[PDB]
Amino acid sequence: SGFRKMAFPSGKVEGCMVQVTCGTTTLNGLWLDDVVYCPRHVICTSEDMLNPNYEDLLIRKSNHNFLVQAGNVQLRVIGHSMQNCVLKLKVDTANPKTPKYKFVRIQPGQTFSVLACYNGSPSGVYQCAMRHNFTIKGSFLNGSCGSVGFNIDYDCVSFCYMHHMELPTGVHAGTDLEGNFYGPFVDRQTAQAAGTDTTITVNVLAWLYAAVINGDRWFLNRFTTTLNDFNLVAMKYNYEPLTQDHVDILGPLSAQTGIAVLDMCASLKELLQNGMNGRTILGSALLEDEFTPFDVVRQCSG
Amino acid sequence: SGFRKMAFPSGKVEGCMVQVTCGTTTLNGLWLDDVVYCPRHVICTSEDMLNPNYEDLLIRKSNHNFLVQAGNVQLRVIGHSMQNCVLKLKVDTANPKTPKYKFVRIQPGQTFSVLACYNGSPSGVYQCAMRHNFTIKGSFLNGSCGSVGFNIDYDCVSFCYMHHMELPTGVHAGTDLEGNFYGPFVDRQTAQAAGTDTTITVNVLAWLYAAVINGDRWFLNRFTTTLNDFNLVAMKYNYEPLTQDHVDILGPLSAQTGIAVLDMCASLKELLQNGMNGRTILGSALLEDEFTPFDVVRQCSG
Ligand SMILES: Cn1cc2cc(Nc3nc(=O)n(-c4cccnc4)c(=O)n3Cc3cc(F)c(F)cc3F)c(Cl)cc2n1
Ligand SMILES: Cn1cc2cc(Nc3nc(=O)n(-c4cccnc4)c(=O)n3Cc3cc(F)c(F)cc3F)c(Cl)cc2n1
């Protein structure tokens, strides 16, 4: 047992990470087959980062303006293209370490692992969720642009996030791997504000189930609730409404624990109206919402 | 910015993970050069797991009793040896993916990344600390025996933990890679109890500094404290006494933030005596003690 913020093993992504430089601007790229993917922002200079026109910027570049570094080996760029907010640099060598992969866009509330890199060098791995305002509460410093988020399904890396920038509040914004931003943000060095966030209710319930699986039961109660009355209470606390699809998704955990979803919702209602009274759940003093039902099942069942 | 539970990239360890079977007992091993390291408990049968004599058990085995599986390739065992609680299986192939590595034993309060594996297959990576009672609060299911904990220094993997077992309270016990247990535990399927734990004070202070670096300042105050008066208050709350060496270690964070260590100790004293009054620090409602000063510097500075 035990319950931890768990990321996917990162090796398959580490073997894809490279450094991309254009002019004096540098960041991280993702080398898959004979293409390197990176934020198009790399073709900006300090003069252009505020209000760039990327079509003009790219038309003014050629292959030789792009330096791609894989370890100590320079990959020669033999083509360049823009796809929305990502640059695609065709190189003359296919990555021998290319894993089986796919580009998948994720939904608010789902989770993924982030491999933070600097200068093409992986430095750390952590787990995060896509918030309902399409930001992620990541951990990123200057130089982390182009770091990727991903999930692993069996042997297949599903890339879902490429990091672009930090917002004023310190949360992070990026795109899927087709270069389409998550949320209403643009790759311009302008002060952009994240919208309002909500608590991912289904995830909180999944985490309460994880706690029960690990012997934390003090928050349980004899009461049950209707879905509608739960939602009436939960909206007041900035929680996402719970739907029947969410109940269905929680079916497996409900079965493994013998606690019906609406019964656990009654526990959640009480915790929202009363607080925790100085107690904890799975070592936390607040309700955790960055674990999906799938993450819980993976960690607690296998 | 941002502050997350961050593990080291795991690829270098993933390429070392193998499956070891003896009889019907199976678990994970660590293949480095031409040696596979695993818990000696693998030579136990269900009859022997309660009160084994491992010297007898190993004398009754030969190389052909050990099946080592690296992916789909079977490695032939050509020698076998015991070193304390780890078995060393000499195989006829050196691991081509062997990273530069070392075996280092860690101290209570220090942190490391865990690569949870099952049947030799890496499944997840998370970060944990060695508690003062020499347990770790890990996340492990049946089949995780032999999973390793490690740190990375530049290009060198410092292995520091091999997982053996789960204690009744759900916390975990294991050895260093020379087979020497952390804490007063033995590799016998007997009900063993973890001793009392304490909060890792220096780590809490390091995390308060991380919070200040990320703009969480509400807990700061004008007061300073002496080291002795802080310790008098902190012992009452089950915190480790703070030493001058701990102050020294916190020097860099103190400098980067301009807040003297004893000033932050005054904040910590107040949080201990008053609680958080419904506020949070770096997204947590309780004081976090699994980040060392080094982890904070690595994440917040680079
Ligand atoms: C020589 N040199 C200077 C460079 C500056 C760069 N800008 C950034 N670097 C970053 O690390 N963070 C960043 C910082 C912290 C966490 N997370 C990301 C940026 O936000 N920006 C700003 C930013 C990035 C975008 F991709 C975008 F569309 C709009 C922006 F305002 C980069 Cl990308 C390369 C540099 N090379
Ligand atoms: C066919 N088959 C059955 C096996 C049973 C095995 N026993 C365990 N497996 C484990 O996964 N956990 C475990 C479980 C959860 C978290 N963390 C570790 C054990 O604690 N034990 C118990 C245990 C392990 C030790 F290494 C030890 F010294 C003393 C113990 F009581 C293993 Cl090792 C292989 C098996 N093969």
Short mmCIF file of C-alpha atoms in Angstrom, two decimals, chain A residues 1-2 4-11 14 115 122-128 137-141 166 170 172 280 283 285-286 290 299-302, chain B residues 1-2 4-11 14 115 122-128 137-141 166 170 172 280 283 285-286 290 299-302:
data_model
loop_
_atom_site.label_atom_id
_atom_site.label_comp_id
_atom_site.label_asym_id
_atom_site.label_seq_id
_atom_site.Cartn_x
_atom_site.Cartn_y
_atom_site.Cartn_z
CA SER A 1 0.00 0.00 0.00
CA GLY A 2 0.80 3.71 0.31
CA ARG A 4 2.18 8.86 -3.70
CA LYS A 5 2.24 11.37 -6.54
CA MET A 6 3.49 8.89 -9.11
CA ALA A 7 4.76 9.72 -12.58
CA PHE A 8 5.38 7.36 -15.43
CA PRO A 9 8.93 6.08 -15.89
CA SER A 10 10.55 8.71 -18.09
CA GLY A 11 13.31 6.83 -19.95
CA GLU A 14 14.48 11.10 -22.08
CA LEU A 115 9.82 15.66 -17.86
CA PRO A 122 16.29 16.04 -18.57
CA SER A 123 16.46 17.24 -14.98
CA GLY A 124 13.33 16.02 -13.23
CA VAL A 125 10.01 14.22 -13.51
CA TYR A 126 6.75 15.05 -11.77
CA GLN A 127 3.00 14.47 -12.09
CA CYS A 128 0.39 17.14 -12.72
CA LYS A 137 0.46 23.97 -11.78
CA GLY A 138 3.91 22.86 -12.90
CA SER A 139 7.44 23.34 -11.63
CA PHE A 140 9.48 25.11 -14.30
CA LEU A 141 12.36 27.59 -14.41
CA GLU A 166 4.73 30.85 -17.19
CA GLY A 170 3.22 31.28 -11.62
CA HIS A 172 2.05 27.29 -16.73
CA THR A 280 -5.59 14.12 7.62
CA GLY A 283 -1.08 12.40 4.80
CA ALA A 285 -4.70 18.21 5.40
CA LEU A 286 -6.70 19.25 2.32
CA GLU A 290 -4.84 15.68 -9.04
CA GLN A 299 -1.54 2.64 -7.91
CA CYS A 300 -3.83 0.82 -5.46
CA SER A 301 -4.80 -2.25 -7.51
CA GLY A 302 -2.09 -2.60 -10.17
CA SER B 1 8.44 28.86 -10.56
CA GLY B 2 6.15 26.30 -8.91
CA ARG B 4 6.37 19.90 -7.01
CA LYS B 5 7.43 16.54 -5.64
CA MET B 6 10.11 15.97 -8.25
CA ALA B 7 11.95 12.72 -8.89
CA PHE B 8 15.05 12.21 -10.94
CA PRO B 9 14.58 11.10 -14.55
CA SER B 10 14.46 7.32 -14.30
CA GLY B 11 15.70 6.09 -17.71
CA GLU B 14 14.93 1.52 -16.11
CA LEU B 115 11.34 3.35 -9.47
CA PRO B 122 9.13 -0.34 -14.37
CA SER B 123 5.67 1.02 -13.63
CA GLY B 124 6.12 4.32 -11.83
CA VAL B 125 8.50 6.84 -10.31
CA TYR B 126 8.04 8.89 -7.16
CA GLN B 127 10.07 10.80 -4.58
CA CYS B 128 10.37 9.92 -0.90
CA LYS B 137 6.43 6.09 3.26
CA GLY B 138 6.45 4.51 -0.19
CA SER B 139 3.81 3.34 -2.63
CA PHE B 140 4.28 -0.37 -3.26
CA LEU B 141 2.06 -3.36 -4.03
CA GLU B 166 5.80 -3.61 3.88
CA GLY B 170 1.80 0.22 5.56
CA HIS B 172 8.16 0.20 3.84
CA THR B 280 -1.90 27.08 2.81
CA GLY B 283 -0.67 24.36 -1.92
CA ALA B 285 -2.40 22.69 4.51
CA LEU B 286 0.35 21.06 6.60
CA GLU B 290 10.23 15.54 2.48
CA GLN B 299 14.08 23.04 -8.06
CA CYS B 300 13.90 26.77 -7.25
CA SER B 301 17.33 27.93 -8.45
CA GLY B 302 18.51 25.27 -10.92
#
